Amino acid sequence: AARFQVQKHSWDGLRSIIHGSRKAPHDFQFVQKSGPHSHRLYYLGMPYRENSLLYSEIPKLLLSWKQMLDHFQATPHHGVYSREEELLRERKRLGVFGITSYDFHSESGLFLFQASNSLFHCRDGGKNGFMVSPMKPLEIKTQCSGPRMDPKICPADPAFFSFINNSDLWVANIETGEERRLTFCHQNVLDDPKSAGVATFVIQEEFDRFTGYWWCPTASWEGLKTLRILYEEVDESEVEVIHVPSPALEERKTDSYRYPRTGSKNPKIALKLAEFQTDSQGKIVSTQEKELVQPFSSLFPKVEYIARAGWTRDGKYAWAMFLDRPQQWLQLVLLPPALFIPSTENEEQRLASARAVPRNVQPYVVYEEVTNVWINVHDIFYPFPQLCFLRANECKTGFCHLYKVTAVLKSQGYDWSEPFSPGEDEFKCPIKEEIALTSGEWEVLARHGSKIWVNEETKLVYFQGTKDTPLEHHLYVVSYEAAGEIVRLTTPGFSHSCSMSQNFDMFVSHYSSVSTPPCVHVYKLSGPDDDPLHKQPRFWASMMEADYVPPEIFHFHTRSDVRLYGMIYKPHALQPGKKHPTVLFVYGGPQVQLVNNSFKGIKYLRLNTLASLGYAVVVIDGRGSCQRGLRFEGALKNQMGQVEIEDQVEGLQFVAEKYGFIDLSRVAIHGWSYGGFLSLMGLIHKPQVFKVAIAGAPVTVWMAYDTGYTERYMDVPENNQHGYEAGSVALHVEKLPNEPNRLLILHGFLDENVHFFHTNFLVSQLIRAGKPYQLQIYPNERHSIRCPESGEHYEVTLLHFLQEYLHH
Amino acid sequence: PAARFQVQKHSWDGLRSIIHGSRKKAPHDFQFVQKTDESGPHSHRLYYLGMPRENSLLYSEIPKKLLLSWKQMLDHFQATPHHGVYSREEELLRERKRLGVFGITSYDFHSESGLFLFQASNSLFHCRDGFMVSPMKPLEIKTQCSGPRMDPKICPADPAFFSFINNSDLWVANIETGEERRLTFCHQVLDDPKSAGVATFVIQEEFDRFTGYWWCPTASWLKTLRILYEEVDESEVEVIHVPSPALEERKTDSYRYPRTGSKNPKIALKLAEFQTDSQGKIVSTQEKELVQPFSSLFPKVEYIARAGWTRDGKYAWAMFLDRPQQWLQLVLLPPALFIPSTENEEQRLASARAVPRNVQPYVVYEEVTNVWINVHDIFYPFPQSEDELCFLRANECKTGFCHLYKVTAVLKSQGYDWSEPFSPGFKCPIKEEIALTSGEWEVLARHGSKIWVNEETKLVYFQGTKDTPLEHHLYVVSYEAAGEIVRLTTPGFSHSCSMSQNFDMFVSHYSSVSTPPCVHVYKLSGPDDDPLHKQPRFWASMMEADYVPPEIFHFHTRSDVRLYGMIYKPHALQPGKKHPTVLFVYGGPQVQLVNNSFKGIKYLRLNTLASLGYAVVVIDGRGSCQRGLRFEGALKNQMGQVEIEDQVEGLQFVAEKYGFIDLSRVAIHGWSYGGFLSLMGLIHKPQVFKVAIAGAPVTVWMAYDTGYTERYMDVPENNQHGYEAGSVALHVEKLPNEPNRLLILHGFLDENVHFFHTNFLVSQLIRAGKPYQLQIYPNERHSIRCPESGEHYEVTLLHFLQEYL
Ligand SMILES: N[C@@H](CC(=O)N1CCN(C(c2ccc(F)cc2)c2ccc(F)cc2)CC1)C(=O)N1Cc2ccccc2C1
Ligand SMILES: N[C@@H](CC(=O)N1CCN(C(c2ccc(F)cc2)c2ccc(F)cc2)CC1)C(=O)N1Cc2ccccc2C1
Incomplete structure (x- = not known):
């Protein structure tokens, strides 16, 4: 034996x-400051009880985790989150109590985040001044009944922020305390299927999009100050309902869920604009729903899922990633704001504003990925100002790589008043050039929160990849001007999860190996500015060890x-x-x-x-x-x-x-x-x-x-x-x-x-x-x-x- | 060790x-029918349910001068829905009775006309039984109603008419003409908490009541026909979700389930009237409510356990229970006490003033215990002959063992001003209360056990454990003279018997530990001047094993x-x-x-x-x-x-x-x-x-x-x-x-x-x-x-x- x-x-x-x-540090923000400390790293972290807003002081050696909030219990009673927030926590697989995420505005120093029932905020850095002690986190009141989901500060104006409340887009003002609802889709169980600003079940679970609305980065001044919000409207009526037991086991009740089976119908979708004007006092003057001149379902037939969306940095275009039902045909589209007319009741009114839309304005289908396997939704899409843009792409070679692409925005001219059904490739842009920035039997990471950091001064794009080996993630720098020598920046033998400074001077790396526990180290990019590609990652400080x-x-x-x-x-x-x-x-x-x-x-x-x-x-x-x-x-x-x-x-x-x-x-x-x-x-x-x-x-x-x-x-x-x-x-x-x-x-x-x-x-x-x-x-x-x-x-x-x- | x-x-x-x-089901639900032929070979016909597959409607012939043949009433026929799957209300009614048998689980019968009514297939059917020899095709009764037609009953006063629940409301229809009229308007889940004619969950699960309406046995002369019914409201009763059988659909169902300590439904008794003419058409209909509200007349009442009418049609009746189930009472309710229900308080007060001062609720019986009231079926009102009310009642509370008592209570009319609202807290004097049976044993009255009372001979036949708790036996005792209790079924066996309406025969489904069951038909024979002592002679057998x-x-x-x-x-x-x-x-x-x-x-x-x-x-x-x-x-x-x-x-x-x-x-x-x-x-x-x-x-x-x-x-x-x-x-x-x-x-x-x-x-x-x-x-x-x-x-x-x- x-x-x-x-x-x-x-x-x-x-x-x-x-x-x-x-018997670790994440969500970094590099803010620069002349005393002893050069930067401040703000981040989320859980010391030896619950996750919370912290900071370190980068000097000129182990950094201290300074408490930013003062005796603050972010987690609810025991840990009983609301019905929607705990499902938001299951979609991201967030199994940690406390502040899971936060929004930040680097100019003003505004931090915005969920905690217990309400939203919270606190001001630090820049024009306010740097704290050297835990700050009292200020509540923001509401006369909305239920929970306020998905907070985001307005990028164009820090006075304003947005949230979802009862399946509709809201906007509030921190300073004046004013609220204002912008969509009216939700009044009920089956009886109210309508919803705006939300990402529905399948989109959260299977496509990793947890938001369904997007602020415009810039503000225009028509004829007051206007701020736009792109958002997905949703209609889950023809989607089959399924009942799943409540955690209230003693209640012996269940919840209705709009669960699409394979084969069954996905929700009916559209993108809509929400404008609103403001004055010097910061009061919301007027608000407007806007919709696409022609229906979303006819401008883009055979589109089933909106994978992603956002704006260009100038606010000259909104954009989106569209997928077909078999998920083998992806498209990138620019939707200019002028293509959206105010949603109105009358047939006589809806053509007046349509006629008023220019013939030159249209949807430009910039990029189109095709395959016989399937589209994986890659996050990476960086438009340069003027269309030039960086995109990740796996379909072309069979491996996810960065390409630089220039698209031709030629206006064909369209009768926007009279009803229009397009041909096969009615909106596709001419691709002027397409340069392979990376190539090989290996992949650029573009999913599950992987991202590029583009530095426009140096003409370099920074990215993570498996170039050395599938077993290890590493940081790589490459020029997008001259697709040439890629330089690895993280040391071999480990797998690294990194995040870069907006100034591209420091960077953090959370890294580990099979034989060694995790460490989180801050590396300074040093070396003269003659050749910015080849700056050595000088080890600066350490956030965590063993x-x-x-x-x-x-x-x-x-x-x-x-x-x-x-x-x-x-x-x-x-x-x-x-x-x-x-x-x-x-x-x-x-x-x-x-x-x-x-x-x-x-x-x-x-x-x-x-x-x-x-x-x-x-x-x-x-x-x-x-x-x-x-x-x-x-x-x-x-x-x-x-x-x-x-x-x-x-x-x-x-x-x-x-x-x-x-x-x-x-x-x-x-x-x-x-x-x-x-x-x-x-x-x-x-x-x-x-x-x-x-x-x-x-x-x-x-x-x-x-x-x-x-x-x-x-x-x-x-x-x-x-x-x-x-x-x-x-x-x-x-x-x-x-x-x-x-x-x-x-x-x-x-x-x-x-x-x-x-x-x-x-x-x-x-x-x-x-x-x-x-x-x-x-x-x-x-x-x-x-x-x-x-x-x-x-x-x-x-x-x-x-x-x-x-x-x- | 080893x-x-x-x-x-x-x-x-x-x-x-x-x-x-x-x-590698037996006969039940018996109906004796005399042949009305002096010179013919058969004395009776037994109608019943049974199997060979499906539990179908059968019959046997009883000769005058031995296995009886199981003759089928229906022409082949398929009572069970395809693949044996019933609808919601059919399947969740079968669970409350623990009915695990395919096909026809119950039928109504009208002994004058020979009219059979039964919920078969996913609809209603009927047949009549001169006396047939070979099978007949049962006619399907048409309808324009959407869902299932539950709880079918022939109208005893008129076999032209019948009733059913449909979307938890009461309906009336006519098998001759085919006309259908809805009587109650309580319904259009969770949104619809009202219901009429329906026995709620706990009434079915824990109180052995399934019907929520009761035909008046007589019609008063056009001619009018009454129906007593429980109006019910489940708004304040907690809702819970239970998984549907359609697992593939992954949906639950909402029940009204009162957990211990939570509210039971708000309840009340109501009449439903409708006149008809010589050509059988329904002329008019009318909801009727009690002249004073239910919760003020009979306060502290939580469950309506049982109900029905006296045979004359004079008084309706109900058995009421308090929330802790330690206090039960049998209330008489004359139709007079119920008035046409209206929102106009002036029109209602004209009807209120019109109800005389003599009309009143008579709390006949009452049962107090420090253990609990078990709901017993047995309540037999005798006809009022020679202001007072004689009746038989089973009563466990008096001694601690369930026995038959003959009671006469005094219905002395007090006098009330029904127009002006009042609030009491009706108790009739008991004139007498004779123990017909007594001892350290019991009469059977729960779970569909019953007495059969022959008025010609002044006897009450009943089921009990007088001989032993291990065996159920058939007994006869007089209700004039509380004397000798004679046993009619033979010892060694437990019996499940059922009597003829003419009290000349009975069937007994009986068995023992050692021996499998038998269904044997016996005949009561002997002198008519000495009726208590009829010897039960084995006449015929319908099953052996x-x-x-x-x-x-x-x-x-x-x-x-x-x-x-x-x-x-x-x-x-x-x-x-x-x-x-x-x-x-x-x-x-x-x-x-x-x-x-x-x-x-x-x-x-x-x-x-x-x-x-x-x-x-x-x-x-x-x-x-x-x-x-x-x-x-x-x-x-x-x-x-x-x-x-x-x-x-x-x-x-x-x-x-x-x-x-x-x-x-x-x-x-x-x-x-x-x-x-x-x-x-x-x-x-x-x-x-x-x-x-x-x-x-x-x-x-x-x-x-x-x-x-x-x-x-x-x-x-x-x-x-x-x-x-x-x-x-x-x-x-x-x-x-x-x-x-x-x-x-x-x-x-x-x-x-x-x-x-x-x-x-x-x-x-x-x-x-x-x-x-x-x-x-x-x-x-x-x-x-x-x-x-x-x-x-x-x-x-x-x-x-x-x-x-
Ligand atoms: N929609 C997918 C999603 C999926 O297949 N994934 C597993 C979860 N996973 C994240 C994760 C979360 C929590 C944790 F503890 C570990 C991983 C993750 C992975 C890598 C990373 F960097 C960060 C997070 C993403 C991929 C699904 O639910 N099923 C479950 C299931 C069950 C049976 C058959 C098919 C599927 C398909
Ligand atoms: N409400 C009671 C009711 C009850 O206790 N009974 C069960 C049903 N039972 C009939 C039966 C039918 C078919 C079969 F297969 C088994 C039983 C029956 C028995 C004899 C007869 F002649 C005719 C019918 C009568 C009594 C309850 O269900 N729980 C279930 C339960 C489980 C745990 C704790 C308490 C209780 C309380």
């Missing part, structure tokens, strides 16, 4: 093992001739010759890479606990995995739960050969979300390989998941019958084991993303087919698991399931 | 095939109270061996599991447990039914606290008497109240019960309804000790830290005991760091209807005991 057996602990024993195991054996990154190749990366958590105190029981950790879906060179000890602590007890833990980024360019991701197209398991097994057999200690007779597939889907999919296809499976929040019916995600990867149901049925674990329950203790199902009862239905439908089908199952519900938890108590029970149940049942 | 019996360990495949091997019956036993407790039990022996027992034991439990009020009737249909899984060598013990402890109010009252305000002692007491007695109980391997298990006591067993007696498999448990009494919880446990404001003491969710710290000791089973669609109870239990288990196993039933409410689920339920149960006991 050369097989290693784990110590079988009692339940109190396992509880103490988990309890024993469990049982557990870390895992080892490794790599292998397939019979199809391609690199897949993996990770191994080595069994603690390993004897060569002994073979250990193996927990294969899984996710395997798109938008995720688990195998990279960064510290895993915080989020994936349980994997090291597993390791501490004797388990081999293996992670494999198979085809579909993120960071490897479009074709690598595209391997899943209309075949989810098919390609993934075969390279999960390939990575496990490889691990058996490279390392000495795997027992392939005792392997356990486990993952949450997509991982749970794959766990269930592993036990269907490879029961010979996987003795047990712990599947958590799986999708069992693809039909029951939404438009945005599903249709991007698996097409519409009517177009992909085979793939929907092949990849839906609930329709293949006949192929789950007849042996009990081989499948443990986990699901959150409040899960608003992947609904409990999937499990409820899997069990329904398991019972029908006559199949044993174990199940664990989390009654107070949604897609993730926030409450510690719940988390501990999960981990204790995990160790007990593997202990008793992953055997022989 | 004394411990170890059950054969089977694979999950093995268990499924054992369970599959296990599984791996199993091993249990044996009933009794033991006494430390307090000297006699508790009955059942035990299933392990099959092919070897004296010496000590077997692992499954204590099957219910333990709540309103149920008796231990009696002398067949168990093998409903409780086959207990024999299946026995077939694999498990001991199965069942004990009816204090709080259980059929033994009078004292015995039930042992629970009052102490649920979860008394029950397990008797259960453990019966379990120790069982290990003594029978030599085969290994007390080291006892598993407690039950559904509903049973699963609650299973959890309470694992908390209070963990040394005694190694595992608990608890199904559909109430884990927070504070979350269960008004009707049930308040009756036994009081309002939470008055009993915070007992609520907390008996809520298993608050005592989770005391549950085991060892895994494999607690399996939780619950129906996801449960609209009675909500899945919340399980949900909230797991929450508290997770907080305490306690292990559990769980199984959901996605397409199941409180009971497990679907075969596949039940099989899965049984395979889990066996595997769980096998692995972990």
Whole structure:
């Protein structure tokens, strides 16, 4: 007997093992100042209790985290956020209490942020003066009833700010205390589907747009001072309703949600302007709804989702990213303000203001990305003033790179009075030039809050990328004038998450590795101004510094001739010759890479606990995995739960050969979300390989998941019958084991993303087919698991399931 | 040692095939009809419901001079909707009756015209029965109404007419002409909180009332026809969301569910009148309300338990209950007391002044208790002959055991000024109150048990436990002379009987522990001058019939109270061996599991447990039914606290008497109240019960309804000790830290005991760091209807005991 057996602990024993195991700066703002301190870094951070507004003093060495707010409890009673704010917190996966974000205006020193019920503000820097003690944070009153969501200061005038209240755009004035509503879409459950300024469910969940309104950066002076706001109008009437249990479990009630199924209708959408004029006293004189001369649905037919939007820096154009329903055709459009006429009741009136719109004014479709895989929504779009602009683009080569583009704004001339339906490419601009600023078998980061910082003086664009290796994020500088020598600025051996000064003199880097915890360091760009590309990142100061054996990154190749990366958590105190029981950790879906060179000890602590007890833990980024360019991701197209398991097994057999200690007779597939889907999919296809499976929040019916995600990867149901049925674990329950203790199902009862239905439908089908199952519900938890108590029970149940049942 | 019996360990495949091997409705709802032919071969025709598939309308012939043929009334016909799926109001009415049988569950019948009316298919149907021989096509009744037509009833005064609820309003129609008139206007969910003719949730779930209107038996001469009905308003009653059966649709349904301590609905009695002419057309209609408001006349009344009319049509009647369910009264309501309802207070006051001073509410009977009022069906008004009112009434409160009393109350007209509003706080004098039955036993009056009163012979036939609590028997006693009670059904068996209107025959659905049921038709024969002593002679039979019956036993407790039990022996027992034991439990009020009737249909899984060598013990402890109010009252305000002692007491007695109980391997298990006591067993007696498999448990009494919880446990404001003491969710710290000791089973669609109870239990288990196993039933409410689920339920149960006991 050369097989290693784990110590079988009692339940109190396992509880103490988990309890024993469990016993950073972000959102930076560089403001320059002559005393000892050159800059001030404002930021959000959580010291050794809750997240809050902090600052450090950059001198001329570890920086102190100075408190900016005075004895301020930003989090509510216990931590009970409002119904909308906690869903806003689930969409961003914000699992920290306190001030999650803040708006800032660098000229005035105005900070604006949510906390408890109301909004708050405090003034610091510039014309007010720098505090050297915690400031009293001032409340802003309202006579709006409910919560005030999505605060943003007016860029053109710091006296004004905006917010959503009851699904409508509001505008207020900090100084005078005045409020004014601008949209009137919302008056009710089904009875009020109308909404303005909001990003609807799918847009938040699947497209990562959490706002639906955009201030104009500049103010015009017609004929008073006018301030415009671009905003998405939304109409969720024909979108199917679904009921999900309230966290008020004692109430025994649910919430209506406009949840689009794959195939079913997405909300009807439009962009609208909201103007308003002000005087010297700062009072709102007049307000106006404006809409597009022709309807949004006819100017841009076959457009389903507004991915992104904003303005140009001059305010001469609003813009948006448009997507088609299959998400294979993206467009960038300029919408000039003169194309918007005041929304009016009368047929006689609506043509008068239409006639008044110039023939020269039109929508100019600047850029258009096309593919056979799918469009990923890349954030990067920097228009220069006058059209020249920087854009990220993956479709062209198959890898996300920066291009510089010049578009020709030639006015064809249009009869805006008489009703107009366009041809195929009616608005496409001539692309004058398109320069490849970056190129290669690697990617520029443009999603999940990655961004470029463009310095106009030097003609350099700063960006993050995988140029050295997929395992590491790094900061790179390149010229957009001359696409030439890219210079790496972050030191190798680590993965960096950086943020730049607006002056381009300092920068912060939050960085880590597999073997080392995270650090947050401030680096000064030094070197003469003769050649600005090649300024050395001089280490200036440190914000943060620094049982557990870390895992080892490794790599292998397939019979199809391609690199897949993996990770191994080595069994603690390993004897060569002994073979250990193996927990294969899984996710395997798109938008995720688990195998990279960064510290895993915080989020994936349980994997090291597993390791501490004797388990081999293996992670494999198979085809579909993120960071490897479009074709690598595209391997899943209309075949989810098919390609993934075969390279999960390939990575496990490889691990058996490279390392000495795997027992392939005792392997356990486990993952949450997509991982749970794959766990269930592993036990269907490879029961010979996987003795047990712990599947958590799986999708069992693809039909029951939404438009945005599903249709991007698996097409519409009517177009992909085979793939929907092949990849839906609930329709293949006949192929789950007849042996009990081989499948443990986990699901959150409040899960608003992947609904409990999937499990409820899997069990329904398991019972029908006559199949044993174990199940664990989390009654107070949604897609993730926030409450510690719940988390501990999960981990204790995990160790007990593997202990008793992953055997022989 | 080798004394411990170890059950054969089977694979999950093995268990499924054992369970599959296990599984491999009787006549009811009788109607006697005399043939009216002196020279013909048949004396009677029995009409009834039954199976071969679907529960369809059948009939048998009773010859004058032996199995009877089950003749079908309908021409093939399909009563069940395709794939066996009913609408909302049909399915949630079947759950309240626990109707788990396909097809026609009930019919109305009119014995003058031979007119049958029944809710079949997704509509209404009718047929007439000269007397047919071969089947007939039942005619579908047309309608322009949108939704389901619920609660169909023939108008007793005129078989041309009938009624139904439609969108929670009362409608009247005519099977001859086809004309349809709506009578009430309460409705157009949440937005529509009013309703008329409808029995609300708690009225159905906890009070055994399903109809909310009552035809007047006579018509007064055009001719007019009255209908009594409960007008109801659920605005102030809390709303809760329960998952629809359309799981694929992922929507809940809103119920009006009054949790304990919350408001019940505002209620009232109202009349609905409509005149007709010689050609059958409805001429006019009229809403009518009580001349004084309902809440001022009969204050402190919370639930309308039962209602109807006297046979003459003179007085309507109702049984009223107070919120703590300790005070019941039977009120007479003459039609005179109700006036045309109008918004014009001057037009209404013209009607108010018009109602005479003599007309009045007469509170006839009244029942006071310090335990609780159980709602009993039996109330028979005799016809008023020779200002006063004689009637028969069942009454548990007087002695503590339910017995028939003949009562005469004085209806002395007081005199009231109905025009000017007043507020009292009607009590009739009782002229006499004779006990017709007495003793330490009981007359059956809940759950559709009834008397049959023959006025020609002055006798009252009834169902009771006079001989033994283990058997229901048919008795006859005179109501003139409270004398000799003669038994008509033979001992050894429990019986479910039903009488002829001419009192010459009866059917008896009867059975025993040892023997499967039979439905036998008997004839009452003997001299007519001595009617009490008719010998019941066997006339004919309509039905006859791996199993091993249990044996009933009794033991006494430390307090000297006699508790009955059942035990299933392990099959092919070897004296010496000590077997692992499954204590099957219910333990709540309103149920008796231990009696002398067949168990093998409903409780086959207990024999299946026995077939694999498990001991199965069942004990009816204090709080259980059929033994009078004292015995039930042992629970009052102490649920979860008394029950397990008797259960453990019966379990120790069982290990003594029978030599085969290994007390080291006892598993407690039950559904509903049973699963609650299973959890309470694992908390209070963990040394005694190694595992608990608890199904559909109430884990927070504070979350269960008004009707049930308040009756036994009081309002939470008055009993915070007992609520907390008996809520298993608050005592989770005391549950085991060892895994494999607690399996939780619950129906996801449960609209009675909500899945919340399980949900909230797991929450508290997770907080305490306690292990559990769980199984959901996605397409199941409180009971497990679907075969596949039940099989899965049984395979889990066996595997769980096998692995972990
Ligand atoms: N719409 C997607 C979204 C998705 O697939 N993702 C996982 C979450 N993820 C963020 C994250 C949040 C919280 C946390 F703890 C970790 C990651 C993230 C990732 C990288 C990063 F830098 C910052 C945040 C983004 C990608 C979905 O909900 N499902 C769940 C699910 C379940 C079954 C089948 C398909 C899908 C598809
Ligand atoms: N309101 C009570 C009502 C009750 O206690 N009863 C159950 C229904 N029962 C009928 C029945 C039908 C079919 C079947 F399969 C089982 C029972 C029955 C029994 C005998 C008979 F002749 C005719 C019908 C009558 C009594 C309740 O449900 N809970 C559920 C529950 C669960 C936990 C705690 C308290 C309670 C309170």
